[PDB]
Amino acid sequence: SKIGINGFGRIGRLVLRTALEMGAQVVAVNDPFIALEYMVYMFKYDSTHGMFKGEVKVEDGALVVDGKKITVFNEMKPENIPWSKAGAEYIVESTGVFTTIEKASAHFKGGAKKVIISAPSADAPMFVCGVNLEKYSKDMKVVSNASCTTNCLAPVAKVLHENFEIVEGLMTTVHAVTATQKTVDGPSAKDWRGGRGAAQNIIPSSTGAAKAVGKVIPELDGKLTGMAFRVPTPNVSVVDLTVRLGKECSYDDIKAAMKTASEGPLQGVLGYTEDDVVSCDFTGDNRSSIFDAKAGIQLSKTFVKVVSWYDNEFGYSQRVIDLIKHMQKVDSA
Amino acid sequence: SKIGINGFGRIGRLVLRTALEMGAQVVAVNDPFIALEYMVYMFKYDSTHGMFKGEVKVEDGALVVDGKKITVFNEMKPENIPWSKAGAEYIVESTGVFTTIEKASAHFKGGAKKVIISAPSADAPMFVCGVNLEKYSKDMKVVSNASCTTNCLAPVAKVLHENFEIVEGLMTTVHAVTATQKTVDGPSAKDWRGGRGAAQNIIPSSTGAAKAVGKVIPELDGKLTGMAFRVPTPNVSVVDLTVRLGKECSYDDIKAAMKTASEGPLQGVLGYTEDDVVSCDFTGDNRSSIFDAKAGIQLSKTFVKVVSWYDNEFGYSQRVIDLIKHMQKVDSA
Amino acid sequence: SKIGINGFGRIGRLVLRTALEMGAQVVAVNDPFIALEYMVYMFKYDSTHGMFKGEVKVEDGALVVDGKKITVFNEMKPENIPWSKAGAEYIVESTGVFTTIEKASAHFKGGAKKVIISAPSADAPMFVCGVNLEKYSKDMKVVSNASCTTNCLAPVAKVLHENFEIVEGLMTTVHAVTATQKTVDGPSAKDWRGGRGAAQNIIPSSTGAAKAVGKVIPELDGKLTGMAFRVPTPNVSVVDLTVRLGKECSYDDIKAAMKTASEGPLQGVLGYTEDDVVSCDFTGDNRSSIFDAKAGIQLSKTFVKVVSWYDNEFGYSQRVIDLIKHMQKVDSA
Amino acid sequence: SKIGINGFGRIGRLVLRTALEMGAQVVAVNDPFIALEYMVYMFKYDSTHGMFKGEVKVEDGALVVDGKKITVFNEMKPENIPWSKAGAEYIVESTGVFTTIEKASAHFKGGAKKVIISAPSADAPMFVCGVNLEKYSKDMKVVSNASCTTNCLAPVAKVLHENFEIVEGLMTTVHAVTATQKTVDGPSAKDWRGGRGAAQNIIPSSTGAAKAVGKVIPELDGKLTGMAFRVPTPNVSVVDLTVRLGKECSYDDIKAAMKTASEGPLQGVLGYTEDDVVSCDFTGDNRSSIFDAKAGIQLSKTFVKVVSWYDNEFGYSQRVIDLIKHMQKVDSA
Ligand SMILES: NC(=S)c1ccc[n+]([C@@H]2O[C@H](COP(=O)([O-])OP(=O)(O)OC[C@H]3O[C@@H](n4cnc5c(N)ncnc54)[C@H](O)[C@@H]3O)[C@@H](O)[C@H]2O)c1
Ligand SMILES: NC(=S)c1ccc[n+]([C@@H]2O[C@H](COP(=O)([O-])OP(=O)(O)OC[C@H]3O[C@@H](n4cnc5c(N)ncnc54)[C@H](O)[C@@H]3O)[C@@H](O)[C@H]2O)c1
Missing domain, CATH: 3.30.360.10 (Dihydrodipicolinate Reductase; domain 2)
Known part of the structure; x- marks a missing residue:
C-alpha cells in the first residue's frame, strides 16, 4: 500500500484512522503547521467519531500508532518532501491547496509515484467508486476523489x-x-x-x-x-x-x-x-x-x-482508501 | 374586535403580542395548563422574540397588559368557556386540538360568533391572506388560517x-x-x-x-x-x-x-x-x-x-389578526 | 444474573445494552406504554450512543437480541408482573415512579427477590459503587443506586x-x-x-x-x-x-x-x-x-x-449492573 | 464626543450601535479586512441583536447611518490611520491586537488624544464603571475597559x-x-x-x-x-x-x-x-x-x-461609551 498523507487535517486524520481499520499502510505524513505532540492529540481525540481506541505516541521524531511507525515531515513545499525516503508511493493530497495537476505534480519531485487529490480538481480526472472506476488508467499520475x-x-x-x-x-x-x-x-x-x-x-x-x-x-x-x-x-x-x-x-x-x-x-x-x-x-x-x-x-x-x-468526511475517507486500492491493483497488473 | 383566544401557547401568546401592536382587541384568554400568575411569566419573557416591553400584571383574577384588562378562564373543554361573559365574539382556536368544524363549534355554546382555527383544518374552509380572502363570506362560522x-x-x-x-x-x-x-x-x-x-x-x-x-x-x-x-x-x-x-x-x-x-x-x-x-x-x-x-x-x-x-411563529400570528380584520369588515358590512 | 427491567426508558434501554456488554443476563422487560416493534426501534437506534451493533428482532411476542430471548410484559401495575414466570429475580426499577420501599415492594408480589431503584429514593438505602458497598447486607430487599x-x-x-x-x-x-x-x-x-x-x-x-x-x-x-x-x-x-x-x-x-x-x-x-x-x-x-x-x-x-x-446515563448504567453483581455475590454467600 | 473606532468586529460594531442610541458621536471607523460595502452589511444584519432599524448606506466612500457621515479607513497598521483627518480624538481600540500601552500609542501619530482598549491590557490602567472611575485622571492617555x-x-x-x-x-x-x-x-x-x-x-x-x-x-x-x-x-x-x-x-x-x-x-x-x-x-x-x-x-x-x-457583547459596549463620557467630562474640566 505504501500510502503517504500530505496535510494532517480533518480528512487527513480520518484517512489515517480508516487506513488502520481497512488494513491499509500509511508510512509517512506531512504537515508544517502541526507540531508532533499536537498531532497525537488531534488524532486521538475526535468530537464526532470519538476516542481512538489503540495506542498513539511520539517516538523518535515519529508517530507510532498501534506499533506502526509513521515518519513525519514538516515541509511547506511539496517538492521538498522526502517521500521516497519514507517509502511513500501513493500520496493522499489533503491540504486543499495543491488540487490541480500542475500543483500536485510537485510531489513527484520527492519520489512519489501517484497522487490522489482528496477534493474536486479543476483538471485532474475525477472518480467516484462504484460509478466510473472503468475510466481509470495506470498511466494517470494525478487523480481526484471528487x-x-x-x-x-x-x-x-x-x-x-x-x-x-x-x-x-x-x-x-x-x-x-x-x-x-x-x-x-x-x-x-x-x-x-x-x-x-x-x-x-x-x-x-x-x-x-x-x-x-x-x-x-x-x-x-x-x-x-x-x-x-x-x-x-x-x-x-x-x-x-x-x-x-x-x-x-x-x-x-x-x-x-x-x-x-x-x-x-x-x-x-x-x-x-x-x-x-x-x-x-x-x-x-x-x-x-x-x-x-x-x-x-x-x-x-x-x-x-x-x-x-x-x-x-467519514464515508469519503473510506472511499479514498478504496480508490487507492483499485489503483494499485490496476497499476501492478 | 372583541377577540378571544383559546390556548395560550406559542401562537396564542404571539397573537396577543401582535394584537397589542396592530391595535386589535383581545378581551379573554383560556388555558387550563397555565395558572394566572404563570401566564404573566410566559407572556413577559420569550426566548425567541425578546422580553415584552410594557406592563404585564395580574389584577382581580385578570391579566392586565398596558392597561388592557383580559379576562382569564381555565376550562379544560371548549363548550364550557363563558366567552359571552367576557364579550368575546371572535375566537382564535390555537390549542391545536379542536381543528375540525365539529370540535371547533363547541365555542358556540359559550356565545362565540366566529371561530378561526390557527392551524390546518380537515373540513373548515382554509384561507391565506393575499391569496383567497375574496372567497370568504359572512355566512361562514368556522374558518382555518392554514x-x-x-x-x-x-x-x-x-x-x-x-x-x-x-x-x-x-x-x-x-x-x-x-x-x-x-x-x-x-x-x-x-x-x-x-x-x-x-x-x-x-x-x-x-x-x-x-x-x-x-x-x-x-x-x-x-x-x-x-x-x-x-x-x-x-x-x-x-x-x-x-x-x-x-x-x-x-x-x-x-x-x-x-x-x-x-x-x-x-x-x-x-x-x-x-x-x-x-x-x-x-x-x-x-x-x-x-x-x-x-x-x-x-x-x-x-x-x-x-x-x-x-x-x-411571528408572521403567522400577524396573519391571524389580519384574517380577523378582514372577516369583521365583511361580517359587519 | 436473572435480571429483569421495569420501564424501557433511556436508563432501561442503556442498562440492557450494558448488560449485553458486561455479559449480564436480562430475561424479561416490562413497559405498558411502548409497543413491541417500537421497543426494537428505540433499542437499536440511539442518537448519542449510536447504532446497536448486533441483531435485534421481535420473535413470538418476545424481543430477541443477539440470540438471547427476552420476555416482554405490558403491566401497568408492578404487582401484576409475572417476574417469576420469566425467571426474573433481580429487578432494575427504572420507571421513575416506584422509587420508595413501599411502592417498590409490589414487585415481590410477582416473584421478584430484590429490587434496585435506578434513581434516588426517599427511604431505600442508597449505594455508590466504590464508596459504600461495605454497608450492603443480604437482607436488604430494596436498594437505590442514587x-x-x-x-x-x-x-x-x-x-x-x-x-x-x-x-x-x-x-x-x-x-x-x-x-x-x-x-x-x-x-x-x-x-x-x-x-x-x-x-x-x-x-x-x-x-x-x-x-x-x-x-x-x-x-x-x-x-x-x-x-x-x-x-x-x-x-x-x-x-x-x-x-x-x-x-x-x-x-x-x-x-x-x-x-x-x-x-x-x-x-x-x-x-x-x-x-x-x-x-x-x-x-x-x-x-x-x-x-x-x-x-x-x-x-x-x-x-x-x-x-x-x-x-x-451511560456510566450510571454500568454502575447499575456493577451493583447487581456485588449484590448477587453477597446474596449467595 | 468625536469618537473613532479601530476594529469593526463584534464590539466595534456594537459600540457604534450603542453610540447611535446613547447619542454619542462616532466620526470614523478603520478595518482592513472589511470593505466599505461589506461594512454596510455586517452592521445592518446581526444574528444575535437583530436587524438594525434605521438607514445604513454607502455614500462618497463614506458610511452614512441615519444621516451620520462616518469616515472609513482600511489601514493595516495603527500609526497610519489619519484620525486627525476625520476629527477623531477618542479612539476605541477594539481589534484585540494592540492592547498594551505601547502598541495602542500608535494611534497618537494619527493625531488621537486618548485611546480606550476594549479589552484587558497588560499595562494600561483598567477601569470598571461604578467600581473605580474615581481613579481616572486626565493625564492618562491610554486606558483599558477590562x-x-x-x-x-x-x-x-x-x-x-x-x-x-x-x-x-x-x-x-x-x-x-x-x-x-x-x-x-x-x-x-x-x-x-x-x-x-x-x-x-x-x-x-x-x-x-x-x-x-x-x-x-x-x-x-x-x-x-x-x-x-x-x-x-x-x-x-x-x-x-x-x-x-x-x-x-x-x-x-x-x-x-x-x-x-x-x-x-x-x-x-x-x-x-x-x-x-x-x-x-x-x-x-x-x-x-x-x-x-x-x-x-x-x-x-x-x-x-x-x-x-x-x-x-451588548453590556460591555454600553460601558465603553459610558467610560468615554466620564473621560471627556474629566478631560474637559
Ligand atoms: N408555532 C408555529 S410555528 C405554528 C405555525 C402555524 C400553525 N401552528 C399550529 O398552531 C397550533 C398550536 O401551536 P403551538 O403554539 O406551537 O402550541 P403550544 O404547545 O406551544 O401551545 C398550545 C397551547 O394549547 C394549550 N391547550 C392545550 N389543551 C388545551 C385545551 N384543551 N383547552 C385550552 N387550551 C389548551 C396549552 O396549555 C398550550 O399552551 C398547532 O395546531 C400548530 O400546528 C403552529
Ligand atoms: N464579546 C466578548 S466576550 C468580549 C467582551 C469584551 C472584550 N472583548 C475583546 O474585545 C476584542 C475585540 O473583540 P471582537 O469584537 O470579538 O473582535 P473580532 O475579531 O470579531 O473583530 C476584530 C476586528 O478587528 C479588525 N482588525 C484586525 N487587525 C486590524 C488592524 N491591524 N487594524 C485595524 N483593524 C484590524 C478585524 O478585521 C476584525 O473585523 C478582543 O480582544 C476580545 O477578546 C470581547
Whole structure:
C-alpha cells in the first residue's frame, strides 16, 4: 500500500484512522503547521467519531500508532518532501491547496509515484467508486476523489439514470456545519452568508456536486444543478434530489432498483434503508450514500423527490482508501 | 374586535403580542395548563422574540397588559368557556386540538360568533391572506388560517402560477424545531423520527402544506407535494420549491414578477430581498413569505428552484389578526 | 444474573445494552406504554450512543437480541408482573415512579427477590459503587443506586475527604439537556425555568446530589450543597466542586491522591486525566467520574476548585449492573 | 464626543450601535479586512441583536447611518490611520491586537488624544464603571475597559466585599461561544481545548477576570481566582462566584445589599432580579451585571454561592461609551 498523507487535517486524520481499520499502510505524513505532540492529540481525540481506541505516541521524531511507525515531515513545499525516503508511493493530497495537476505534480519531485487529490480538481480526472472506476488508467499520475457530496449523489443518480433516465434534476444538500464556518457573526469576504453565526442559522450556500456529477457521468452533464443549506448539526448531511425521469415508473420500482443495487454492484457504496432514521444514525457509516426509502415522495410517474444520507468526511475517507486500492491493483497488473 | 383566544401557547401568546401592536382587541384568554400568575411569566419573557416591553400584571383574577384588562378562564373543554361573559365574539382556536368544524363549534355554546382555527383544518374552509380572502363570506362560522408553511408557499405559488403557469412542483421545507419534538431521544408512537433528539439531528418529516395549497389555489390541486426536514434552530424556516413551469422564462423574469407582486397586490404579505440573508435576519418579520432572490437557481427555461423565508411563529400570528380584520369588515358590512 | 427491567426508558434501554456488554443476563422487560416493534426501534437506534451493533428482532411476542430471548410484559401495575414466570429475580426499577420501599415492594408480589431503584429514593438505602458497598447486607430487599450526578461527586468527595478532610463545599454541575426539558418555551408549572427553550438557554436548575452525598458518606452530611446549569449539549455533564479543606495541601497532592485512587481501589469507577479534554471525549465512558487534572484551580492551601466529568446515563448504567453483581455475590454467600 | 473606532468586529460594531442610541458621536471607523460595502452589511444584519432599524448606506466612500457621515479607513497598521483627518480624538481600540500601552500609542501619530482598549491590557490602567472611575485622571492617555467578565464580577465583588468582606473566592464563568473558537475540531496551537468543535462541547477555558478584579479593587488582590466553561450559546454568559465572607450573614442580607446597590450607587450598572430568568432574557441588556437572587445558594453564614448574568457583547459596549463620557467630562474640566 505504501500510502503517504500530505496535510494532517480533518480528512487527513480520518484517512489515517480508516487506513488502520481497512488494513491499509500509511508510512509517512506531512504537515508544517502541526507540531508532533499536537498531532497525537488531534488524532486521538475526535468530537464526532470519538476516542481512538489503540495506542498513539511520539517516538523518535515519529508517530507510532498501534506499533506502526509513521515518519513525519514538516515541509511547506511539496517538492521538498522526502517521500521516497519514507517509502511513500501513493500520496493522499489533503491540504486543499495543491488540487490541480500542475500543483500536485510537485510531489513527484520527492519520489512519489501517484497522487490522489482528496477534493474536486479543476483538471485532474475525477472518480467516484462504484460509478466510473472503468475510466481509470495506470498511466494517470494525478487523480481526484471528487467531493463528499458528489460521492453521495453520483451513486444515486447512476441507479436512477440507468433505469428510468434522468431528463433533468435540481438538488439541495441539507449540510452539517463545516470548518470554513464561524461560531459568531464574523468576516467572510468570499461568502457573506458563510460568515454569519453557524449555531444560530440556516445558511443558504453553494455546492459544485451537481456539476461534478456531469463529469463523473457524462450523459448527465448539464442536466443537474443545485444548492445547499448549512444547518446547526455537527456531522452527517442529506441529499434532497428532485428529478424528472424519462421512463414512467412507480416509487416502488425506484426502491426496488436502489435495493437491488445496494445488495449487488454498489454494495458497500450505496446503502438502503426503510427504517425511521435521523441524521445521527449515520455517524460512522462506511457507505458513500444511504437511500432513505420512507423519506422520498413521488408526484407523478416521472416526477419524484429522492433522499440520501451520507456521513460527511467519514464515508469519503473510506472511499479514498478504496480508490487507492483499485489503483494499485490496476497499476501492478 | 372583541377577540378571544383559546390556548395560550406559542401562537396564542404571539397573537396577543401582535394584537397589542396592530391595535386589535383581545378581551379573554383560556388555558387550563397555565395558572394566572404563570401566564404573566410566559407572556413577559420569550426566548425567541425578546422580553415584552410594557406592563404585564395580574389584577382581580385578570391579566392586565398596558392597561388592557383580559379576562382569564381555565376550562379544560371548549363548550364550557363563558366567552359571552367576557364579550368575546371572535375566537382564535390555537390549542391545536379542536381543528375540525365539529370540535371547533363547541365555542358556540359559550356565545362565540366566529371561530378561526390557527392551524390546518380537515373540513373548515382554509384561507391565506393575499391569496383567497375574496372567497370568504359572512355566512361562514368556522374558518382555518392554514399552517405556517402554507402561508409562505401559497403567495409564492400564486405569483409563479399566474405568470408562468406551474405544471408540477415538489417542495422541501427546512423547518425550525417545534413544541412537539423532543430534546433527547424519547417516545413518539405516531412519528418515530419525531421522537429523536431535536438538538442533534436533521429529522425528515411530513407536511401537508403543499397539498393545502391545492385547496387555496384550486388550479394547483394535485400538482404540488412535498416533505420536511426539522433542523436544530429555534425559529424561522425556509421553503425550497423545485418547480416546472409551463412558459419558458429567465430567472430575471421570475425576480421581476416577485418584486412587482411585493409592491402591489401582495405587499406586506410577500417580501422580496437580494441581500445575503440568513435565517436570523427574519426573526420578528411580519411577512408570510420573503423571496430570497440570490438563493434561487435555474436549470432550464422551464425548470427552476425557488427559495422563500418565513418566521413560522411571528408572521403567522400577524396573519391571524389580519384574517380577523378582514372577516369583521365583511361580517359587519 | 436473572435480571429483569421495569420501564424501557433511556436508563432501561442503556442498562440492557450494558448488560449485553458486561455479559449480564436480562430475561424479561416490562413497559405498558411502548409497543413491541417500537421497543426494537428505540433499542437499536440511539442518537448519542449510536447504532446497536448486533441483531435485534421481535420473535413470538418476545424481543430477541443477539440470540438471547427476552420476555416482554405490558403491566401497568408492578404487582401484576409475572417476574417469576420469566425467571426474573433481580429487578432494575427504572420507571421513575416506584422509587420508595413501599411502592417498590409490589414487585415481590410477582416473584421478584430484590429490587434496585435506578434513581434516588426517599427511604431505600442508597449505594455508590466504590464508596459504600461495605454497608450492603443480604437482607436488604430494596436498594437505590442514587443518581447519575451523585455517582460522579461521591468518588471525588471520598478521595478528597479521606486525605485532606472536607470542611464544607459548594457544587455546580454544568449539565447536558435532559428529557424533562422543552425544545421551545412551554409550560412547566413545577419548574418555570425548566420550561424555557432548551437549545437557546443556560438554565439555572436544581440537584439533590450534594445532599445525597451526605447519605452515602455520613461524615459529609450537611457540609455540601449545590445547584446546576442546564446547557445546550446532548450528553455528558461536569461537576465543578469548590471545597474548603481541613489539611493544608498543594494541588499536586490532590492530583496524586486522585491518580492513586484511579489506579487502585477506585479503578473503573474514578478515572484520571491530564489531557486537554472536552465533554465529547467522554461519550460512552464507563467510569462514574473522571478527574480533569488541568481544569482545576487552587486559591490557597485549603481552598480549591476541582473538576470531574461523567457521561450522564451511560456510566450510571454500568454502575447499575456493577451493583447487581456485588449484590448477587453477597446474596449467595 | 468625536469618537473613532479601530476594529469593526463584534464590539466595534456594537459600540457604534450603542453610540447611535446613547447619542454619542462616532466620526470614523478603520478595518482592513472589511470593505466599505461589506461594512454596510455586517452592521445592518446581526444574528444575535437583530436587524438594525434605521438607514445604513454607502455614500462618497463614506458610511452614512441615519444621516451620520462616518469616515472609513482600511489601514493595516495603527500609526497610519489619519484620525486627525476625520476629527477623531477618542479612539476605541477594539481589534484585540494592540492592547498594551505601547502598541495602542500608535494611534497618537494619527493625531488621537486618548485611546480606550476594549479589552484587558497588560499595562494600561483598567477601569470598571461604578467600581473605580474615581481613579481616572486626565493625564492618562491610554486606558483599558477590562473584559466582559471583569465588568460583571467587579460590581458584585464590590458589594459583597464592602458589606461582608471577601476573605477568598473562586469563580466559574459559564461563557457563550466567542469569535476565537471553532465550529468543528480544528487547530489552535496555543489553546488545544479551544480548537475543539464549539457546537458539541463544554470546553474548559481560562480567564483573567478574577485576577483583574484584584487590580480594579486593590484589596481583593490575590484573594480571587477562577476559570471558565465555554458552552454552545451565541451570547449571554453567567458568573458563578463561590465566596467565603468575613462576617456572618444570611442570604436575605446579601439580597438586600444587592437590591440597595442597584437603586443607588450602581444603578444602571448592577441589576437585581428575583424572576425565574434564563440566558436569553438578557440579550440586549444594558447592565454590566444582573444579580439572580433565586439562583444563589448559601451553605453557612460565611460560605455562599452567588450568580450574576451579563450580555457579554451588548453590556460591555454600553460601558465603553459610558467610560468615554466620564473621560471627556474629566478631560474637559
Ligand atoms: N408555532 C408555529 S410555528 C405554528 C405555525 C402555524 C400553525 N401552528 C399550529 O398552531 C397550533 C398550536 O401551536 P403551538 O403554539 O406551537 O402550541 P403550544 O404547545 O406551544 O401551545 C398550545 C397551547 O394549547 C394549550 N391547550 C392545550 N389543551 C388545551 C385545551 N384543551 N383547552 C385550552 N387550551 C389548551 C396549552 O396549555 C398550550 O399552551 C398547532 O395546531 C400548530 O400546528 C403552529
Ligand atoms: N464579546 C466578548 S466576550 C468580549 C467582551 C469584551 C472584550 N472583548 C475583546 O474585545 C476584542 C475585540 O473583540 P471582537 O469584537 O470579538 O473582535 P473580532 O475579531 O470579531 O473583530 C476584530 C476586528 O478587528 C479588525 N482588525 C484586525 N487587525 C486590524 C488592524 N491591524 N487594524 C485595524 N483593524 C484590524 C478585524 O478585521 C476584525 O473585523 C478582543 O480582544 C476580545 O477578546 C470581547
